[PDB]
Design a protein around this ligand. Structure first.
Ligand SMILES: [Mn+2]
Ligand SMILES: [Mn+2]
Lengths: 177, 178
């Protein structure tokens, strides 16, 4: 009906013409942010040559989380990760009725549109940028922001939860029924 | 200090590797949406070959607004449009302190990052997606939306105003202040 899908994507870099997706995860909530179901956490395999070309930053952080070794031993291709993720989404959503949500909205949707076209056409074109509410709250209600602390997050699903919790706080403190 | 830049971009299509910018305009407001200044409306010239390759949709709407004939007679290059727009922004903003605002946030920032790198590095990385508030209001306060009607808009600056007015309404009806 009008559920929301939340996704976390890790990539080898920022340029979609050169870089690729290496980890994705999905969580589906409803309109009032109560989670309907948690989706799969897929590590996509990329060629060992592509990983050696990443810059300092992406090599430091992806080796610090253990994603690089997961990619090395993964057998999952991009088309395969798309089907398993889309099979999860299709069970809880209708086509072209669910927007993307998170803090990397434009960054995620670039790689989604290029590397997973069937998933991107099942999603609705709209987005819910949680980051757009934090920048608005800086000017209109700065007193609210002291009462929220983003917590440590190590897994992909915990990254998604911390974004949903951030929007809960804007819902219960910044907005009006 | 705390100002916001608003931009309206028209392109020959959606793929930045093939398509280009043909019209841009800028308006700068402050934190509470009172407009500080209105910027230039530049029509960027592209080769006549590129315009003939646009699909039905982009050819129908850009010929319906008269942009195609403006591009044909324009002498302004992309680097030139960037300097005049950046000269306007640099007068009212500080570097890396002003985010983008509008309803085509991701779509505009793709072409901005590729075709105008000096402008994109002067802007702050953050955005204010007005469209993200309309989708949120659909679930949390649908009673608000009946009281707003997007009005007809024909120029580029009037397109920007209608986005600013949309955010005014969310400010004065959806949010909680002080
Ligand atoms: Mn993550
Ligand atoms: Mn326009």
């Amino acid at each position: 009906p009008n559920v929301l899908v939340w996704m976390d994507l890790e990539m080898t870099g920022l340029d979609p013409e050169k870089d690729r997706i290496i980890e994705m995860a999905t969580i589906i909530t409803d309109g009032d942010l109560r989670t309907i179901a948690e989706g799969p956490v897929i590590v996509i395999h990329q060629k060992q040559e592509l990983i050696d070309g990443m810059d300092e930053w992406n090599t430091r952080t992806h080796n610090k989380t253990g994603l690089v070794t997961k990619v090395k031993t993964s057998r999952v291709t991009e088309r395969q990760a798309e089907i398993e993720t889309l099979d999860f989404i299709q069970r809880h959503t209708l086509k072209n009725r669910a927007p993307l949500c998170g803090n990397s909205i434009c960054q995620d949707r670039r790689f989604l549109y290029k590397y997973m076209p069937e998933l991107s056409e099942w999603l609705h074109y709209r987005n819910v940028d949680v980051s757009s509410f934090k920048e608005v709250a800086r000017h209109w209600a700065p007193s609210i922001l002291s009462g929220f602390e983003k917590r440590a997050s190590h897994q992909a699903l915990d990254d998604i939860k911390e974004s949903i919790e951030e929007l809960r706080y804007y819902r219960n403190n910044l907005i009006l029924l």
